[PDB]
Amino acid sequence: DVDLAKSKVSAVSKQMNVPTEGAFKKFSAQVKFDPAKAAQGSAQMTIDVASFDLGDKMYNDQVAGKDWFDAKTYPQATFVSSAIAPAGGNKYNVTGKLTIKGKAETVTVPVTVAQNGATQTFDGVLPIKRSAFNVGTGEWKDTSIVADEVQIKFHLVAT
Ligand SMILES: CC(C)=CCC/C(C)=C/CC/C(C)=C/CC/C(C)=C/CC/C(C)=C/CC/C(C)=C/CC/C(C)=C/CC/C(C)=C\COP(=O)(O)OP(=O)(O)O
């Protein structure tokens, strides 16, 4: 499987002179994938949500708090695949369970895969609604302040 230092998971939000992008500095992931048997593959990711870095300590503290991630109550977010559907041209629709702030949803993410030497790379973007996971509640429900749509971007490098 993977390499954190070589890999990146980020989230892009809007409001609306944006992107505002933050990156999770601590996560793990496991991938098992052979394009000759793609549907037999699997992947999981576990993110340490308190490691989310927007490049600003006050923003980082706010987003860790109860109305946002509530990182003390829910320290991790997870994705676990259940199916992989080839989409043609090194693209695969990867379906699985995304759990954020203790709320689970089935999601399908388009992933592009490349191999070069002993390295495999997995790139994709998953749009979600933060409200679906109750991320940014209370006064932060107002989507004229922070948009509901958040794009989760990942670049996973294995071996
Ligand atoms: C074929 C194969 C095997 C492929 C591999 C498959 C594979 C590994 C796929 C991976 C797919 C996925 C889903 C990967 C990600 C996995 C996980 C667990 C993702 C969860 C990440 C996560 C916690 C996402 C939630 C992100 C959210 C909703 C973040 C909130 C966004 C945020 C913090 C916005 C804050 C806005 C900011 C910084 C400031 C606002 O400032 P403000 O005060 O309002 O300014 P003003 O007042 O001026 O307006």
Author numbering: 5 to 163
Paper passage:
YceI proteins are a family of bacterial lipocalins (BCNs), which are small proteins widely conserved in Gram-negative and Gram-positive bacteria but whose physiological role is unclear. In this study, we discovered that secreted BCNs contribute to antibiotic resistance by capturing and neutralizing antibiotics in the bacterial milieu. Visual inspection and structural alignments by the DALI server confirmed a barrel-shaped lipocalin fold for both proteins. An octaprenyl pyrophosphate was bound within a long, hydrophobic tunnel extending from one end of the barrel in each structure.
Analysis with the PDBePISA server predicted that BcnA is a monomer, while BcnB is a dimer, by crystallographic symmetry (~2,840 Å2 of buried surface area including a portion of the tunnel opening). Superposition of BcnA chain A and BcnB chain C (148 Cα atoms, 22% sequence identity) resulted in a root mean square deviation (RMSD) of 1.66 Å. These studies suggested two distinct docked binding modes for BcnA. One binding mode involved residues in the rim of the lipocalin pocket.
